[PDB]
Design a protein around this ligand. Structure first.
Ligand code: CLA
Ligand code: CLA
Ligand code: CLA
Ligand code: CLA
Ligand code: CLA
Ligand code: CLA
Ligand code: CLA
Ligand code: CLA
Ligand SMILES: CC(=O)O[C@H]1CC(C)(C)C(=C=C/C(C)=C/C=C/C(C)=C/C=C/C=C(C)/C=C/C=C(C)/C=C/[C@@]23O[C@]2(C)C[C@@H](O)CC3(C)C)[C@](C)(O)C1
Ligand SMILES: CC1=C(C/C=C(\C)CCC[C@H](C)CCC[C@H](C)CCCC(C)C)C(=O)c2ccccc2C1=O
Ligand code: SF4
Ligand code: SF4
Ligand code: SF4
Lengths: 86, 184, 670, 59, 200
């Protein structure tokens, strides 16, 4: 599994949530921006690592950062279809 | 004790006088007009071109063009006579010692190119400074562009006057230094 | 109507695409502007504009081809030794191409005739002119004039159709009308027109030249007025192709005229048949393939296949007079059409992928795994078999065990079907020769021919694997389930799932171009070595044959070292030792430049754009230091563009290397 | 010009002792046709300016 | 919409107010509308003056040249090579000094008229012999200067090209056995096709 971290610079775009192809991200209420909402990654075990969330993030440097961990890959982080690891 | 054999063929000047600092005193080189390899090479050029010429008709245009080529080759032979060539190749050399007063010296082309290259760079920089917009880089303001192009001739003086007066460089704290290397 | 044809958009670059309307903020904007220039589908406005753009651009390109033809005709009339070539084609190399005497470039022109010096052309235009009964300079003048008039007409038509066609325009969608009129009026009614042209201008002329009257009484006989010669004057019974014309070393032009007449009749009858014939099975294909990209792909594949048929049929089915002996011309005519076949096949695959992404695919995409899997297995099988017979021969020859290799004098793999394929030609049991030169002798196919044909099959199958894998896995895949939303061309989907680089159909074309290039480089080498070794060459009066390569193919082409030594090294002596030699200086220089360009491509092929972006930023620091700010911000090439540039330079450099290598050698030997 | 040349009117130079048919080629090879083309080129540049400024309504 | 007095079929060039040729406004291409016409006037005046001096020197050299010790080529074009390098160096040095000092170092189309917008073509040299005409015949004097400058420019061009077509001196106009000019010995594509150099 990868590591998807959300930083304080988030401005509640919701673009990262919409771009995620495996429903890793979600919007949670907060009080650090005018949108009163920040992103969260409660399900990074389903994060394939496509980094579309990083493409969609418009902050100066990404408020959402995906750290690839190749020696950590699970069946969900690899998108295995022909083969089951469970 | 024969420095040629001591050093495996290469020969050393063995003399410490300022008169040998010129390239013309080198024993590797020799004036082209009295070098055997130069004579042989340009004679072979003449022979090959002449042999090609005889293959065509006498009254054809190709014959006249080959005569013109032969004249060009002979003019090249007589023009490179004062140029220095090695005592073993016959190919004339280019002098890159800053001599300023020898045939084939690299000082004159260097000066000419540096002037015109500074001219080009100065014209481009002036246009970029006077058009601080992206729209002016895709749709060139041709009158202003040619104005800067003509104005670039005084670059060796204007550029220095900007260097000393603090109008060329910019302090590092005003442009993006680069990627962060620390924070924690 | 035409009041809207305004220049106001000429200054406004990038107007056609709404993604470029934000302005040139970065240098990526320039490359995107060039990339979307001909992508009429994604450009602004309705579908009618797409049709107008496509049709008018077709007309403009047709005008461009006509202009190229006109240039060739004017070069032949005013910058050529076509006169002396007409008088004596066996002693004069064709040349309609001079070089100015600048920077010593005069060394490029070589002796072609006693009154002419120039670059030996290998386009075969002189043979075409002679087969077209063109003798006087006035005929070439008027051919050039007609081609220029056609250029102007097609340019004006392209200009007009951008406003003649409207939103209601529908003539392009009438596929029944297009097929019927094309077939009948062009393939039938123009083939018979060319048959008429030949019967009335070639047979009156080409037999006169072959009859030894190159004089032809000037215009007294050559300018038609020869209705006392009969159409089938010198058919000499026999069968078309069994007996060649002994003078010009080609099929008699009367037989060619009869061929064109009969083919026109056949096409007209097929157009009549199409009123009631076999249908209702290709009907799903009929309804599902009415789109620009699908018909473009179909036409590209068809034209490329026709190009390869032309490449194989222009060499040992000699049609043109005095062309079989002109070995550089034969080589060029084969190899150029081979390369065009490969390139247009690749384009057909690309546009199949584009159609799949824009339109809706057909039934074959649902069992795509068995298809693209048995294709994988067959590619592996014929790669581990065809090539390795070369590796086996190489290893056992290096070991000193020649009796264990695959050769004719050893374990031999007989080409059973080809050896039993004496159906083609079926000529008499001897050879044909014109003047110290072999016209055509039957290629005796042995073990080496078997192995190299299997190499060809393997390379073709791998290129097809890449193309069909790109086409079938365009919409979605087990790897990425929404490839349709990603578009046609994309760098990747991200480093996730292990890595998703080069999943797009565009990247599949990117690999397929490399594999097609590798596929027909072997085809070029097989042809270039086989013809020299076993067909082309001198002769001896005692019926003995001395070929150019002295029969190296059957003894050396069984091992990779044989290809390296006897083809890429021994036969490269002409190009490598081509400096200061009048005709072949540019070929040596272009050999060097092709090596440089091919190696230069590797910088784009092996590297990623992030390193170059960081380097560009480092340089931009120095630029900003001296108050030199490019407001079109410098960005490195996009990933797809980096791959495209790498592929283009790779193929261009390699093609130039082969081009120089083959052409210089054939010019020296001839 | 054709009338005058055919009827025998010529410039006082032996280089002009040609028929009217060969006058064009002979004078092209002689030089004056190139100079005439240069002069007609400048006059036609002025004419082109006239057309451009008339069609646009500037004059 | 007025028209120019010189070319009546063209629009009257704006930005060409009265400087000299205000009666015959002549700018078909329209450089005055494209460039700072004060710089254009400065360039025209410098060209005219340099060409007056050039015509006088070009005429004088074959006859009353011959500075004591300098060699004499009849063809005034060759006088550059057949002259002492020292005198030529000193002359170019003086010309550069005059060019640099006259404009106070603002010798640049961008910086020529930026703060010292004095007057187009005025250098304060010999102005004591002007302005006594009550600003009316002074304009006529400026007109005469401009007309002489333009005539001198065209005349010097003609003299150079006459010396080239003759390949000799200048004043022996139409020398003996010259029989007309055909001296441009440079090949051309039209020349190549006409002379049958290519083809055949
Ligand atoms: C579209 C095909 C095509 C191609 C590839 C060429 C290529 C060439 N032509 Mg050419 N030509 C063409 C069409 C073409 N032409 C047509 C349609 C005509 C009739 C109008 C001509 C008429 C023509 C003449 C009359 C001459 C050439 C010449 C040349 C050569 C040098 C061109 C030159 O000096 O640059 C010129 C570059 C520019 C003008 C920049 C624009 C070059 C190989 C010359 C040549 O071979 O000299 C020996 C020459 O004299 N061409
Ligand atoms: C492949 C070439 C091609 C094709 C398929 C067409 C097809 C067509 N043209 Mg067209 N055209 C062409 C080349 C072509 N043109 C060229 C090269 C020119 C320049 C001379 C023209 C000039 C032209 C004009 C001026 C007109 C057409 C018109 C037409 C339409 C009816 C003409 C007809 O019956 O046939 C038809 C859609 C006519 C049209 O749009 O009908 C309403 C019409 O007015 N064309
Ligand atoms: C389709 C293209 C085409 C064209 C434009 C021409 C053009 C020509 N051919 Mg021709 N020809 C062609 C194809 C063509 N040919 C083919 C494919 C062949 C087969 C080999 C011939 C065989 C041929 C011969 C043998 C002769 C010509 C002749 C001619 C010339 C005058 C005859 C004519 O125009 O027919 C006019 C039209 C007809 C004769 C057809 C009338 C049929 C009637 C209307 C039907 C009723 C018949 C009745 C019921 C019984 C003319 C230059 C003649 C020639 O030399 O003249 C210079 C000549 O003797 N041609
Ligand atoms: C009945 C008249 C006739 C005649 C004289 C010819 C004559 C010819 N055809 Mg041909 N052809 C004809 C009818 C005819 N064809 C018809 C009706 C068709 C439609 C099926 C074709 C389809 C056809 C193709 C597809 C090809 C030829 C080719 C050839 C040439 C090679 C001949 C050869 O080696 O044959 C040996 C027996 C020769 C000029 C070949 C060619 O052009 O070679 C370059 C070729 O590839 N023909
Ligand atoms: C009839 C032939 C034909 C036609 C009409 C089209 C038409 C189209 N193609 Mg296409 N294609 C073709 C053949 C054709 N192609 C072939 C044979 C191939 C295989 C190589 C391809 C591969 C291909 C790809 C991979 C893509 C297209 C795309 C497109 C679309 C936009 C093209 C564009 O804007 O490029 C603008 C034009 C250029 C950028 C031309 C630049 C010059 C090229 C790239 C380099 C050539 C180098 C030159 C030969 C050597 C130089 C000489 C040297 C000495 C200096 C358009 C629908 C693109 C698309 O999005 O489709 C919807 C796309 O991604 N095509
Ligand atoms: C369309 C106008 C036109 C053009 C293109 C030419 C072109 C030519 N004329 Mg010509 N000519 C013209 C009008 C024209 N003429 C008229 C109206 C007259 C009557 C005065 C003449 C009288 C004339 C003579 C007497 C001669 C030529 C000659 C020539 C040839 C060499 C150029 C030369 O010396 O001309 C000189 C032209 C003039 C002195 C007349 C110019 C008068 C007005 C401005 C025109 C050249 C082919 C010469 C030549 O080669 O003949 C074989 C020659 O000897 N022309
Ligand atoms: C644009 C004007 C112009 C230019 C570029 C030159 C340039 C030149 N003149 Mg010159 N000259 C001019 C106007 C000009 N002159 C005028 C107006 C007169 C008449 C008073 C002369 C009278 C004159 C004489 C008498 C001689 C020259 C000579 C020369 C050459 C040597 C340099 C020199 O005399 O330094 C002068 C520096 C101060 C040099 C090429 C000499 C030369 O080389 O002749 C062979 C020479 O003997 N000139
Ligand atoms: C041809 C010879 C030549 C001569 C004699 C001069 C002479 C002069 N120039 Mg000058 N200049 C020349 C060529 C020449 N220039 C060229 C070719 C250019 C174009 C690049 C310029 C561009 C130029 C500018 C832009 C400026 C001058 C200035 C000056 C003056 C200042 C001198 C000074 O204080 O130096 C002091 C003494 C020194 C030794 C410093 C020189 C440094 C050397 C090169 C080391 C002086 C009258 C300046 C001025 O104000 O004019 C009044 C000025 O702003 N010149
Ligand atoms: C102390 C102080 O302050 O200084 C004062 C001093 C003073 C005197 C008061 C001043 C002044 C005025 C000056 C210096 C005025 C000089 C004016 C000159 C030299 C004019 C030359 C014109 C040449 C022409 C038209 C050539 C024409 C040539 C032609 C037409 C040639 C015509 C030919 O056909 C002819 C004749 C022959 C053929 O070969 C072809 C060619 C040569 C072309 C100042 C400026 O105020 C400053
Ligand atoms: C070198 C390189 C660059 C940098 C190269 C760039 C930006 C090319 C653009 C440079 C200029 C604009 C090209 C213009 C042409 C040349 C200046 C001259 C070519 C012709 C000469 C022979 C005269 C990338 O951006 C890149 C991106 C992705 C994968 C690989 C690479 C890559 O390899
Ligand atoms: S895209 Fe970036 S800034 Fe926007 S909500 Fe997601 S993490 Fe926050
Ligand atoms: S890398 Fe892809 S899967 Fe993972 S959180 Fe980002 S968008 Fe979702
Ligand atoms: S290396 Fe390049 S192509 Fe591969 S996943 Fe990363 S960005 Fe995409």
């Amino acid at each position: 599994s990868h590591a998807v971290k959300i930083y304080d610079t988030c401005i509640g775009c919701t673009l990262c949530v919409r771009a995620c192809p495996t429903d890793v991200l979600e919007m949670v209420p907060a009080s650090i921006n005018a949108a009163k909402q920040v992103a969260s990654s409660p399900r990074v075990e389903d994060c394939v690592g496509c980094k579309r969330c990083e493409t969609a993030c418009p902050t100066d440097f990404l408020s959402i950062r995906v750290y690839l961990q190749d020696n950590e890959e699970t069946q969900y982080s690899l998108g295995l279809d022909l083969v089951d690891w469970s | 004790a024969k420095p040629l054999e001591m050093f495996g063929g290469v020969d050393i000047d063995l003399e410490d006088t300022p008169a040998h600092w010129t390239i013309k005193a080198s024993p590797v080189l020799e004036p082209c007009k009295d070098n055997k390899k130069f004579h042989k090479k340009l004679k072979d050029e003449l022979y090959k071109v002449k042999k090609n010429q005889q293959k065509f008709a006498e009254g054809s245009a190709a014959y006249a063009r080959f005569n013109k080529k032969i004249k060009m080759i002979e003019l090249r032979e007589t023009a490179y006579g004062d140029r220095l060539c090695g005592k073993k190749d016959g190919l004339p050399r280019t002098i890159a010692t800053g001599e300023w007063n020898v045939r084939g010296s690299a000082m004159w082309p260097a000066a000419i190119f540096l002037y015109i290259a500074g001219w080009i760079g100065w014209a481009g920089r002036s246009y970029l400074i006077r058009t601080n917009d992206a729209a002016k880089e895709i749709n060139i303001d041709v009158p202003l562009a040619v104005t800067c192009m003509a104005s670039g001739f005084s670059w060796p003086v204007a550029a220095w006057q900007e260097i000393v007066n603090g109008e060329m460089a910019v302090p590092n704290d005003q442009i993006h230094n680069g990627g962060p290397w620390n924070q924690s | 109507i035409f009041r809207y044809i305004n220049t106001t958009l000429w200054a406004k670059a990038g107007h056609f695409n709404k993604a470029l309307s934000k302005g040139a903020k970065t240098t990526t904007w320039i490359w995107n502007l060039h990339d979307y220039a001909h992508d009429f589908d994604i450009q602004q406005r309705s579908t009618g504009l797409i049709a107008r753009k496509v049709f008018s651009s077709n007309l403009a390109h047709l005008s461009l081809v006509f202009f190229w033809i006109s240039g060739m005709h004017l070069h032949g009339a005013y910058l050529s030794n076509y006169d002396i070539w007409l008088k004596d084609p066996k002693s004069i190399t064709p040349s309609s191409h001079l070089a100015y005497s600048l920077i010593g470039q005069d060394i490029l022109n070589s002796y072609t005739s006693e009154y002419f010096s120039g670059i030996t052309i290998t386009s075969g235009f002189f043979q075409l002119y002679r087969s077209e009964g063109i003798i006087t300079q006035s005929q070439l003048k008027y051919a050039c004039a007609t081609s220029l008039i056609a250029t102007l007409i097609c340019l004006s038509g392209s200009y007009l159709h951008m406003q003649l066609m409207s939103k209601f325009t529908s003539f392009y969608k009438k596929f029944q009308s297009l097929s019927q009129d094309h077939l009948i009026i062009i393939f039938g009614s123009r083939s018979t027109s060319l048959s008429a042209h030949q019967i009335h201008k070639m047979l009156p002329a080409n037999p006169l030249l072959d009859s030894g009257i190159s004089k032809p009484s000037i215009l007294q006989v050559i300018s038609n007025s020869l209705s006392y010669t009969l159409a089938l004057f010198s058919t000499n019974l026999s069968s078309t192709g069994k007996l060649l014309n002994p003078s010009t070393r080609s099929v008699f032009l009367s037989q060619v005229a009869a061929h064109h007449k009969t083919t026109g009749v056949v096409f007209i009858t097929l157009g009549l048949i199409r009123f009631l014939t076999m249908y209702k099975s290709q009907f799903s294909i009929l309804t599902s393939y009415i789109d620009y990209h699908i018909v473009l792909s179909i036409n590209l594949a068809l034209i490329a296949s026709l190009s390869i048929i032309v490449a194989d049929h222009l060499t040992r089915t000699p049609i043109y007079p005095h062309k079989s002996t002109s070995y550089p011309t034969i080589l060029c005519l084969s190899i150029h059409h081979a390369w065009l076949s490969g390139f247009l096949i690749i384009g057909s695959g690309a546009h199949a992928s584009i159609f799949n992404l824009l339109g809706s695919p057909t039934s074959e995409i649902r069992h795509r795994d068995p298809i693209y899997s048995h294709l994988i297995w067959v590619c592996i099988a014929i790669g581990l078999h065809s090539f390795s017979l070369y590796c086996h021969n190489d290893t056992l020859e290096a070991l000193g065990r020649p009796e264990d290799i695959f050769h004719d004098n050893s374990i031999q793999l007989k080409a059973i079907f080809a050896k039993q394929s004496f159906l083609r030609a079926e000529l008499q049991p001897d050879i044909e020769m014109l003047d110290k030169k072999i016209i055509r002798i039957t290629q005796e196919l042995g073990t080496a021919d078997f192995i190299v044909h299997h190499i060809h099959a393997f390379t073709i199958h791998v290129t097809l694997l890449i193309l069909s894998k790109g086409v079938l896995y365009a919409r979605n895949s087990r790897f990425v389930s929404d490839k349709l939303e990603l578009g046609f061309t994309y760098p990747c989907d991200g480093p996730g799932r292990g890595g998703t680089c080069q999943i797009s159909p565009w990247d599949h074309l990117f690999s397929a171009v490399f594999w097609m290039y590798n596929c027909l480089n072997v085809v070029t080498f097989h042809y270039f070595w086989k013809m020299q070794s076993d067909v082309w060459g001198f002769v001896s009066i005692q019926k003995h044959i001395s070929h150019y390569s002295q029969g190296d193919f059957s003894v050396n082409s069984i091992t990779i070292n044989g290809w390296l030594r006897n083809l890429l090294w021994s036969e490269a002596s002409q190009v490598i030792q081509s400096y200061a030699l009048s005709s072949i200086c540019p070929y040596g220089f272009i050999f060097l430049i092709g090596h440089f360009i091919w190696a230069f491509s590797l910088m784009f092929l092996f590297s990623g754009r992030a390193y170059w972006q960081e380097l560009i930023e480092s340089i931009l620091w120095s630029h900003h230091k001296l108050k030199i700010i490019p407001h079109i911000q410098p960005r490195a090439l996009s990933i797809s563009q980096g791959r495209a540039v790498g592929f283009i330079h790779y193929t261009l450099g390699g093609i130039g290397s082969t081009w120089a290598f083959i052409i210089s050698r054939l010019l020296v030997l001839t | 010009g054709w009338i005058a040349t055919d009827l025998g009117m010529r410039l006082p130079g032996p280089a002009y002792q040609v028929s009217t048919l060969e006058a064009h080629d002979a004078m092209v090879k002689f030089g004056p046709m190139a100079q005439i083309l240069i002069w007609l080129g400048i006059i036609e540049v002025f004419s082109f300016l006239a057309i451009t400024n008339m069609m646009e309504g500037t004059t | 919409k007025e028209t120019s007095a010189s070319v009546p079929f063209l629009p009257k060039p704006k930005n060409l107010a009265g400087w000299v040729g205000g009666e015959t406004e002549f700018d078909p291409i329209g450089f005055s509308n494209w460039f700072d016409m004060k710089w254009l006037r400065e360039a025209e005046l410098k060209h005219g003056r340099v060409c007056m001096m050039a015509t006088v020197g070009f005429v004088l050299q074959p006859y009353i040249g011959a500075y004591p010790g300098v060699e004499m080529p009849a063809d005034s074009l060759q006088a550059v090579y057949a002259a002492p390098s020292e005198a030529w160096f000193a002359f170019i040095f003086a010309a550069g000094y005059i060019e640099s000092s006259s404009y106070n170092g603002k010798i640049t189309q961008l910086n020529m008229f930026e703060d010292s917008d004095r007057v187009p073509g005025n250098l304060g040299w010999g102005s004591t012999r002007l302005e006594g005409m009550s600003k009316e015949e002074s304009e006529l004097m400026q007109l005469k200067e401009l007309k002489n400058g333009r005539l001198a420019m065209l005349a010097f061009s003609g003299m150079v090209h006459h010396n080239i077509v003759v390949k000799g001196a200048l004043f022996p106009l139409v020398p003996d056995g010259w029989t007309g000019p055909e001296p441009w010995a440079v090949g051309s594509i039209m020349n190549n096709x006409x002379x049958x150099x290519x083809x055949x």
